[PDB]
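Forum: Protein Structure Q&A
Topic: Joint prediction for protein chains with partners

I've read a bunch of threads here and the consensus seems to be that you should model interacting components together rather than docking separate models afterwards. I'd like to see that in practice. Below is the full input, 1093 residues plus whatever partners are listed. Could one of the regulars post the assembled result?
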Amino acid sequence: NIPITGSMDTVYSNSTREEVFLTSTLCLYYPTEASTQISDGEWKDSLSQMFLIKGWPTGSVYFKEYSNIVDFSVDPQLYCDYNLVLMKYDQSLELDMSELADLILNEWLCNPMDITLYYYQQSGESNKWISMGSSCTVKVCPLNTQTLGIGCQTTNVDSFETVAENEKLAIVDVVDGINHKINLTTTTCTIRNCKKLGPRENVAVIQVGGANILDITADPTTNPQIERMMRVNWKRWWQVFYTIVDYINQIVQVMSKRSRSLNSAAFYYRV
Amino acid sequence: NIPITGSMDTVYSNSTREEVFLTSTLCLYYPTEASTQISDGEWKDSLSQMFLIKGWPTGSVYFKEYSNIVDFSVDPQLYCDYNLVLMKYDQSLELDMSELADLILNEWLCNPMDITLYYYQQSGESNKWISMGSSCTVKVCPLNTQTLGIGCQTTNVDSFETVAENEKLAIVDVVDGINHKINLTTTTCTIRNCKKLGPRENVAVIQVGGANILDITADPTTNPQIERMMRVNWKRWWQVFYTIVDYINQIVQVMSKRSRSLNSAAFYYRV
Amino acid sequence: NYGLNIPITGSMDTVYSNSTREEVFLTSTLCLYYPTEASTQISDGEWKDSLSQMFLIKGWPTGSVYFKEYSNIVDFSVDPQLYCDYNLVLMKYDQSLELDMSELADLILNEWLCNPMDITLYYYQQSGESNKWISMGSSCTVKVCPLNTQTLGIGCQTTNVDSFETVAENEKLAIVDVVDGINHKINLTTTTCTIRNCKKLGPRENVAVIQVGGANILDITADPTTNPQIERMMRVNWKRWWQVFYTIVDYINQIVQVMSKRSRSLNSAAFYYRV
Amino acid sequence: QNYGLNIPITGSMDTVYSNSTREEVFLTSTLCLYYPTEASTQISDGEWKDSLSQMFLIKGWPTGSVYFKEYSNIVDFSVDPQLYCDYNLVLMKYDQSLELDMSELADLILNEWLCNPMDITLYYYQQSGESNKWISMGSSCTVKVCPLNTQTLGIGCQTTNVDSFETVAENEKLAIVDVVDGINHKINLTTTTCTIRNCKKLGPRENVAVIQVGGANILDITADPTTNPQIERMMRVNWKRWWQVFYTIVDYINQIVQVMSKRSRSLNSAAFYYRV
Ligand SMILES: *[C@@H]1O[C@H](CO)[C@@H](O[C@@H]2O[C@H](CO)[C@@H](O[C@@H]3O[C@H](CO)[C@@H](O)[C@H](O)[C@@H]3O)[C@H](O)[C@H]2NC(C)=O)[C@H](O)[C@H]1NC(C)=O
Ligand SMILES: *[C@@H]1O[C@H](CO)[C@@H](O)[C@H](O)[C@H]1NC(C)=O
Ligand SMILES: *[C@@H]1O[C@H](CO)[C@@H](O)[C@H](O)[C@H]1NC(C)=O
Ligand SMILES: *[C@@H]1O[C@H](CO)[C@@H](O)[C@H](O)[C@H]1NC(C)=O
Ligand SMILES: *[C@@H]1O[C@H](CO)[C@@H](O)[C@H](O)[C@H]1NC(C)=O
Ligand SMILES: *[C@@H]1O[C@H](CO)[C@@H](O)[C@H](O)[C@H]1NC(C)=O
Ligand SMILES: *[C@@H]1O[C@H](CO)[C@@H](O)[C@H](O)[C@H]1NC(C)=O
Ligand SMILES: *[C@@H]1O[C@H](CO)[C@@H](O)[C@H](O)[C@H]1NC(C)=O
Ligand SMILES: [Ca+2]
Ligand SMILES: [Ca+2]
Ligand SMILES: [Ca+2]
Ligand SMILES: [Ca+2]
Ligand SMILES: [Ca+2]
Ligand SMILES: [Ca+2]
Ligand SMILES: [Ca+2]
Ligand SMILES: [Ca+2]
Ligand SMILES: [Ca+2]
Ligand SMILES: [Ca+2]
Ligand SMILES: [Ca+2]
Ligand SMILES: [Ca+2]
Ligand SMILES: [Ca+2]
Ligand SMILES: [Ca+2]
Ligand SMILES: [Ca+2]
Ligand SMILES: [Ca+2]
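Posted by a regular:
Agreed with the consensus. Here's the joint model:
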């Protein structure tokens, strides 16, 4: 990063809202029960026409339905330029909802893990292991300096310490600085060693249900309410979508253009 | 575009080949008979590795099969950042190959036509009508200033002068200045009035078979040869792919990044 | 040691003059290479004598003109020996021979330096864009298997030749290119077909390839981007071999004016075998 | 690099060249031994190539830097002898009555010949001068020459009666035939099995050294009768055992290579004259 000098007297520039609405795309990820309750199917076209009033051209809005939160957690591709994630809260899904929110909101640099050969440590605070799949049950057996289990026997998977069971997505943090042996169902689930970089400006999460419960920061001490974790009450999905459409300017104002020299190619819905 | 002054003694910048290969995607479009002759199926991954040797990241190369030339001709969507189009020449497909090459190689600004109602002229030299679908059969009837057909009755479609039949794609040019009544088979084909902007520098077409026959310029007088219309003799598709991979530096150098502000969203494959 | 390091200073105003002499042969020699189709259609056998008699009036003394007769393009591609000084090669175009004609043209029109390749023992690479592998013989089936850095075949198992990848099958001549900098394990029928690691020096200009038939299809440069039109890549249009030979004889002064007797080699081979 | 031009080279005479030191040619070049098959038969072995390569390594030549190209016998090797190699040694075993065949083979592989083709059934030929010969190579060459006077009428021979021709060689796999320089000749030889080429002699070939293993000095390579030079590359050694001969060659290989030199035509310096 080179320095960029700037005066403190230059006049504020005009509003760039129209430029960004003409140049960018918005995409909404909502659960299937939304469409089920709406009981329609001209509704995507109607909402596109409705967005056109707020100033998003006809092709700018992309509605990507997903089955439900736990099933969408498994490797979410956010094919867009401004991402909204409607997220219906149900009791006992708190941790999984938080996991998904952390995953998409935060920028991660992930490396493959070969569970069958190497025992993996965690470098520090920012490192986690993310396991995604149809059913991930990661079991961890910590190891000594001589590679012998403590609280576990390295060859008896039954004595291992389970930290996730049958979960589509698990973000495990273990004690940093200790080698571990992992048992995860290699045919089903894929585990990656990831480091949390800064935040992802592209995505916003609209919790639809209950109290302020999302905790992106795995640290117990800090529980910061980030601006992109919006929340709203609901009884009717039509009311939720009308709320979003009416207040779309505020939402995209909260979000901001993504900035990262990525290396993994993937499909994007850009103009 | 505002003026851009420049000095004639600026030192040449360092090469950007590494940067562009690190921040772009190469985008191969090959016929299905290619893979059938290959008789393999790790070959996509193997070619990705052989591209990684040349410099591209592991996922930056995207392979897209297509059925055959006309079936690709209908709706060419180039879902990626540097497009190479392998194109096997066989006899009697000269004009459809040329039509496809022209359509992908030039930028078109274009909009629909409601054939059943209006009469349509053509603005000038750079204004064609592009018909795409399962089976296009344009049948045109020129009119007079009095709105009576010449060589054709305005009502009797049987007297209309057909200018293409049963083609998946047709880039039809008619006399520029005469109101034409069109019949086209609305079910299995759609016709859109299109105007030709500057070149689409993002694509490059590699004719695999025999001699130079592509004539993208519909004008008889001019038959220019463009750097992006490559031609390579062949007997084995493995040899074709190996030549392309080895000389990819030359190909991407010949090709340039796109420059056109689109008003439409689409699925690109970027990094 | 021809002192090929010091510059030669010319002058830009003096003069247009004559070339003195050179005493290694009484005069240059012209040298046709035609297919047997020509003889069969001509249906003669004093015709070489007649063609020599007609070159004599063009100004070529008797012993200077020689004729060579190859079976066809593929059978000439194997070890094309140019035993001679001004070589013309009449290549009758036929459909599906486009790549083979291009192979032969790229072979003879350019000056190759070839090393041996012991396929059974070692893997091989390609140093740069100018380095090809040239395989010749009665029948070549070059199956390659590229290996990663760890000497593990990618897309192929080095122990199973069936998984190897056939870049060219059953060819009399194959100028095969593979991705540069990657080791390859090669497999070809060593009894019948041999292979060589050949780098491309500059162009050879004894040879004029006269495509007798169709359109401009010769692509000597393996680069897909470039497709140059060399002056020696001639293309004439034909109905009858008498007309073809008569055109060559009539215009032979231009044919040799566009060539150079200098770039000639001791041995008649199409490459310099450097062991 | 200014190829294809004769441009003079000026050079100081009193230059120290204290940097100049011995060049280790063997670290890069490739030695290349040709021996008769009876050598192998007497040796009665089959890792002797390996043993000699190991001994060459101990002299200094890398493992892959020595080739052993067997040849059946002198006559069968004489036909189209192609020495595509970087330092050729040829162990010619001498037998009585093979004097001229050894001499002509040695001439062929010691002198660089520039060869034009010939069409015997179409043209008459005359040798330009001292440096020109006709090289006839094949399974069995039988050259019959009919000299022709100015009126194209044969002398000592009828132009049509091949039988009256004057045989200059018969049943020879190699024949460097020299005739009167300045006389047109009509040639006759068995075109299917033997080829003949009009060959000028350029300078010497320095890539090749010929160890005569047997008798006295008989190699008169110069077709002139007056001059009988002894080129240093025409080496000679007595013998009673092929193992002894091979050990001698391996022991003294450095001196042999000093006698030899890099092929002049092979270098880039000869790029546009007659490069090979
Ligand atoms: C982490 O722990 C699980 C729990 O055991 C491991 O599952 C085990 O996987 C192996 C290989 O897939 C199974 O081996 C099987 O053995 C039977 C006979 O014992 C044989 O018929 C099969 O062909 C196969 O070899 C093993 O049964 C299976 N264990 C259980 C309880 O089903 C898992 O492999 C561990 N993770 C890693 C990375 O090894
Ligand atoms: C910015 O806003 C002011 C006030 O509305 C307007 O006068 C000006 O033209 C705007 N800037 C541009 C570039 O249009
Ligand atoms: C500058 O160019 C040189 C080429 O010699 C290259 O090695 C170097 O990496 C380049 N530096 C940058 C920053 O691109
Ligand atoms: C074209 O003509 C056919 C036959 O008269 C008719 O069925 C079809 O509807 C016509 N299409 C249009 C667009 O007029
Ligand atoms: C050079 O060649 C031409 C060819 O016609 C000849 O007329 C001329 O006399 C020659 N030069 C000299 C100095 O004779
Ligand atoms: C080529 O492959 C065949 C099997 O198809 C094998 O028998 C042969 O030895 C291989 N050639 C070489 C030189 O290894
Ligand atoms: C050796 O030294 C001389 C002068 O001392 C110099 O001209 C020459 O270039 C040097 N050559 C080498 C190979 O060092
Ligand atoms: C050599 O002589 C024989 C004997 O008559 C003859 O048949 C043959 O044609 C002669 N060779 C040539 C090249 O004419
Ligand atoms: Ca335990
Ligand atoms: Ca979870
Ligand atoms: Ca941790
Ligand atoms: Ca927390
Ligand atoms: Ca078409
Ligand atoms: Ca009509
Ligand atoms: Ca027009
Ligand atoms: Ca044209
Ligand atoms: Ca394979
Ligand atoms: Ca071939
Ligand atoms: Ca190559
Ligand atoms: Ca080319
Ligand atoms: Ca003899
Ligand atoms: Ca006689
Ligand atoms: Ca003589
Ligand atoms: Ca003598």
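The interface with chain B takes residues 22, 25, 57, 59-60, 62, 79, 261-271 of chain A (CB under 8 Å).
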